[PDB]
Amino acid sequence: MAGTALKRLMAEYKQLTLNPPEGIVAGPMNEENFFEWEALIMGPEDTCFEFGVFPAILSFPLDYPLSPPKMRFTCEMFHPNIYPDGRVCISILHAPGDDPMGYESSAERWSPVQSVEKILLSVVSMLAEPNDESGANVDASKMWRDDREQFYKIAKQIVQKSLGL
Questions:
Q1: Which of 34, 124, 136, 138 is a Cys-bridge partner for 89, taking CB atoms 3.0 to 4.6 Å apart?
Q2: Is residue 146 within 8 Å of 132, Cβ to Cβ?
Q3: What kind of architecture, by CATH, is found in domain 1-165?
Q4: How far is residue 7's CA from residue 13's CA, in Å, rounded to a whole number?
């Protein structure tokens, strides 16, 4: 349940502190309860999410690092590989077997926990390279596949709203 999860997140902590990855800013919500972290997703440069600073919360289960954590963006977002409810529905934070709709588990899925740094870099990859995996947000995948221009402008608008406009 606990302990090995906490220690895993302490390892995540330390290396994140020592070797801070670009675009990712994250720390636990009160050093007592390491089972939830807050993160700032600095939008990939040269993309429609650049200037955006997307805050999110990561909820860690009493099954870490065996089981995939939970993640949601707090000032919402708009991307096909993300739920319209804001919750993060990404291919790498998904469990092998938790692949609905139609696609196969031959794609990349929950590894030996990966690392939070790997996970959020996958988020960055997702934001500079829009992947419509599954299509959690069908409306977002629709407008991404149909009119990229529309997606692009929505992306910029989320960017400014994340700043507070």
A1: 136
A2: no
A3: Roll (3.10)
A4: 9
- Cβ atoms within 10 Å, residue 26: 20
Note the residue count of the chain: 165
Question: Which tokens sit at 64?
Answer: 């870490």
55, amino acid identity:
P
Q: Which residues pair with 56 in a beta bridge?
A: 39, 73
For the purposes of burial, counting CB atoms within 10 Å of the CB of 122, is it exposed (0-12), middle (13-18) or buried (19 or more)?
Answer: middle
Specify which residues 55 forms β-bridges with: 40
Name the nearest CA neighbour of 123 among 134, 131, 111: 131
- Tell me how far the alpha carbon of residue 40 is from its chain's centroid: 10
User: Which residues fall within 8 angstroms of residue 162, CB to CB, at 6 or more apart?
Assistant: 52, 53, 54, 55, 75
The tokens of 93 are what?
């934070």
Catalytic residues: 89
Q: How was this structure determined?
A: NMR
139 closest CA partner among 81, 100, 70, 56: 81
Q: Are 5 and 62 in contact (CB under 8 A)?
A: yes
* Cα 5 from Cα 3, distance rounded (Å): 5
